[PDB]
Structures are given as structure tokens and as C-alpha cells.
């Protein structure tokens, strides 16, 4: 065979495309996933750090408010 | 004033944190947006490429097979 | 004509399929975008509400601590 | 004790807020993930459908161009 052989070439090429692409999309998503928890953990720590300092302020304002 | 000033500091820094982050998130998203249409246009072109070449195959398997 | 028409039809349809999908993807993304700032504003408010709470606590554990 | 208790309430209350949020985000993402492969499989199938038909056209065009 020759043409019907070339035919089988494509049908295999294609089905090789879908599988390839479906992996890629998953990489795209996992990639986002990571850059997502990353931001999230940063933003968070900050928001927390903040809380850890709005403490000491209200702290000093009344913890030292005894000798004052 | 002084403590009631240090108070005003934090109150302000916070409202800054929010605004910052609210933007960073938008950058994160726009970033994904791009890496998304990008993949999408690649994947597509390919899938279209396939369609372009699967043309000639079935073409020549019968356009040249007419002389055969 | 005849096939040259059914041929033009497909080329027509195809350029239409891309048009469509290219938009849908945008809807998918906008959709995520929204469910994203939404969560982000919730999570945030909470994290902020928590800031108001941890305030009054440190507050009263020392605000009326004068009468103690 | 008491304040040292109300303190402990929040300290734990907060460390609980993170847990919640940290998972909620994962639901948001998994959610997107699904709506993503879903669209992707749809769009794809269609794009392939087009192929299984741009075939028959060029097909019946010249396959029947033997009796013509």
C-alpha cells in the first residue's frame, strides 16, 4: 500500500496531537495553580504580619499605659 | 498626638495592602489570560495545519489517482 | 457551481468555528476572573473582620484594665 | 484565666481561617480546571468533526468524480 498507508500516517499524527495538547493544557493549568498559591501565601503572610504589628502598637499604647 | 498617630499609620498601610494586592491579583489573572490565548492560538493553528495537510493527502490520493 | 460551493461552505464554517471558540474562551476566562475577585474580596473581608476582633480583645484586655 | 483565653480563642480562630481559605482556593482552582478541560474537549471534538467532514466533501467530490 502507499496512499492508504499515507492515510494511516495522518490518523496517527492527529491522535498524537490531541494527546500532546491535552498534556500541554494540563501544564498550563498546573503552572497557574502554582503561581496562584504562591501569591496567595505571600498576600496572606503579609496580611498576617500586619496583624502581628497592629498588636504591638495597641500593645505599647496600653501596655506602657501603666507607667503613664 | 503620638500613639493615635501610630494608629493612623497602620490604618493607612492596611488600606494600602488591599489596593496593592487587589492589583497584583489582576496581574496574575491577565498573565494567565495571555498564556491562555497563546496556547489556544498555537494548539489551534496546529489543528488547522493538520486540516490543511490532510487536504493534499486525500487530494493527491485521488487527484493524481485520476491519471492512474 | 457545485463542489466549489460545498468547498467554500466549509472554509466559511471553519473561519466561523474559530471566531466562536475564540470568544467562548474569553467567556470562560472572564467567568474565572469574577469568581476570583469574589473569593478574594470575601477571604479578605474576613481576614479584615478578624483584624477588628483581635483589636477589641487586646483592647478590653487592657482598655478597662485601668479599673483592674 | 480569661483574656489569655480569649487570646487563645482568636489565635486558634485565625489559624483556622487560613485552613478554610487555603482549601476554598483549591476548590476554586479545581472548579476552573474542570470547566477548562470541558471546553477544551468540546472545542476539540468540533474541530475534529470538521475534519471528518472536510473529508467526505473532498471525498465524494472526487470519489464520485470517477463516474463523472
Amino acid at each position: 500500500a502507499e496512499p492508504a498507508l499515507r492515510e494511516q500516517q495522518l490518523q496517527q499524527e492527529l491522535l498524537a496531537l490531541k494527546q500532546k495538547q491535552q498534556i500541554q493544557r494540563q501544564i498550563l493549568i498546573a503552572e497557574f495553580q502554582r503561581q496562584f498559591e504562591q501569591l496567595s501565601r505571600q498576600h496572606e503572610a503579609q496580611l498576617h504580619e500586619h496583624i502581628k504589628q497592629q498588636q504591638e502598637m495597641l500593645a505599647m499604647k496600653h501596655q506602657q499605659e501603666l507607667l503613664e
Side-chain angles (χ1 to χ4, degrees), chain A residues 58-68:
Chain A
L58 278 194
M60 295 274 266
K61 175 181 181 175
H62 244 72
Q63 67 176 300
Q64 181 181 64
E65 188 66 358
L66 262 34
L67 310 77
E68 306 175 304

Side-chain angles (χ1 to χ4, degrees), chain A residues 23-57:
Chain A
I23 293 285
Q24 281 198 276
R25 277 193 280 288
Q26 290 187 183
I27 295 168
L28 177 65
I29 279 303
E31 185 187 64
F32 181 81
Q33 207 295 314
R34 164 179 167 287
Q35 276 164 287
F36 181 59
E37 195 62 61
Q38 180 168 293
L39 197 50
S40 288
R41 302 223 161 181
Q42 285 173 187
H43 284 185
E44 205 185 65
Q46 305 189 303
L47 255 170
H48 264 43
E49 176 231 1
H50 179 293
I51 278 191
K52 177 180 178 300
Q53 297 175 183
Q54 192 250 48
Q55 163 203 296
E56 296 165 281
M57 169 286 238

